[PDB]
Symmetry: C3
Subunit: 40 residues, 3 copies
């Protein structure tokens, strides 16, 4: 399938990005998106 | 609760979207957001 | 590491946000991003 599974998910409050490691190809592809990060 | 759990998470480097399958209602609802996708 | 693991992921179709609970600090930090939500 064109969509591929996420194997690990992390987020970073310095860069304000979340990064999803993908099961695809050689294993070195990620998805990454902007995000808010805050303390509740 | 208004927030509902994600059951499966996939991302697509053709559409540049990630899709989260949700545990809600009939099971056919998703969350989907734009994302970057790249090789590290 | 600057990126930290997500422990739980939820999405909300009233607020159109997904929220990732993070393993960081006191445990009360989240990442949150805008998202589409729809029925397939
Ligand atoms: C003791 C200790 O260490 N304690 C820990 C804390 O330090 C740590 O908190 C982090 O601390 C960082 C350092 O203080 C701090 O970094 C600063 O952040 C400032 C604010 O950043 C916001 O505004 C800027 C500019 O507008 C944006 O670029 C940022 O992205 C951010 O904006 C946010 O962006 C996201 C993504 O786009 C938005 O998200 C969207 O939200 C909407 C809804 O609103 C939807 O949901 C969307 O879907 C979603 O995507 C957010 O809305 C938005 N939020 C806001 C309020 O706008 C920066 O301004 C600041 O940058 C300056 O300083 C650095 C160096 O320090 C320079 O490199 C930069 O260039 C810049 O320098 C300035 O440059 C200008 C001009 O260029 C100049 O005029 C100035 O004078 C310069 N100033 C200086 C000082 O040089 C800097 O980056 C972090 O913000 C802060 N993080 C958080 C989350 O609070 C906390 C948290 O730890 C972090 O998170 C955890 C989870 C871990 O990952 C951890 O490792 C990480 O550190 O932990 C404390 N420890 N504890 N407990
Ligand atoms: C052999 C093999 O198959 N190898 C595999 C590779 O093929 C595969 O890589 C994919 O290859 C695709 C085909 O080459 C390629 O598609 C093209 O992509 C071009 C670039 O797309 C970017 O720009 C366009 C336009 O600006 C945007 O629409 C796209 O969304 C994308 O922009 C990105 O968008 C995201 C989301 O908004 C941004 O994300 C944000 O980032 C910020 C920070 O920057 C924050 O984090 C935000 O939170 C975050 O959301 C990105 O920043 C941004 N990036 C950039 C750089 O801007 C398209 O331009 C191109 O489209 C043209 O061609 C198609 C048909 O081919 C037409 O349908 C389109 O209409 C368009 O046609 C053109 O139309 C114009 C005018 O309308 C005309 O003038 C032109 O002449 C027309 N040209 C043609 C040719 O017709 C096309 O879609 C993929 O980009 C490429 N993917 C990646 C990730 O590199 C790789 C990867 O595989 C993919 O990913 C994996 C994970 C799996 O899902 C897999 O199934 C999937 O295929 O794998 C190789 N195999 N291996 N290993
Ligand atoms: C019986 C039952 O209960 N059934 C259940 C359904 O109720 C439930 O569906 C939810 O129902 C809600 C109530 O009807 C409904 O709320 C309304 O939504 C309207 C539409 O909201 C869209 O447009 C507005 C404005 O433009 C935006 O603010 C919203 O964010 C949203 O836009 C979307 O935003 C996201 C994020 O930015 C976009 O995402 C991006 O997408 C792009 C691609 O497009 C990329 O992927 C990006 O990465 C991604 O981020 C979307 O694209 C975008 N979509 C669109 C189409 O634009 C609101 O307009 C409406 O607000 C009015 O009413 C409320 C009160 O009701 C007021 O508080 C507001 O202020 C506002 O009031 C109006 O104010 C104006 C001026 O200020 C005034 O002129 C008007 O007269 C006022 N009107 C009123 C009536 O007062 C309101 O919020 C939900 O939309 C609907 N949700 C969905 C998903 O369909 C469903 C689903 O349940 C939900 O989801 C699940 C998963 C669970 O979480 C659940 O708990 C939750 O309820 O379930 C049914 N049950 N079943 N099965």
């Amino acid at each position: 399938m064109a969509p591929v599974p996420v194997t690990k998910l992390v987020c970073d409050g310095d860069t304000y990005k979340c990064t999803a490691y993908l099961d695809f190809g050689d294993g070195r592809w990620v998805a990454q998106w902007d995000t808010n990060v805050f303390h509740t």
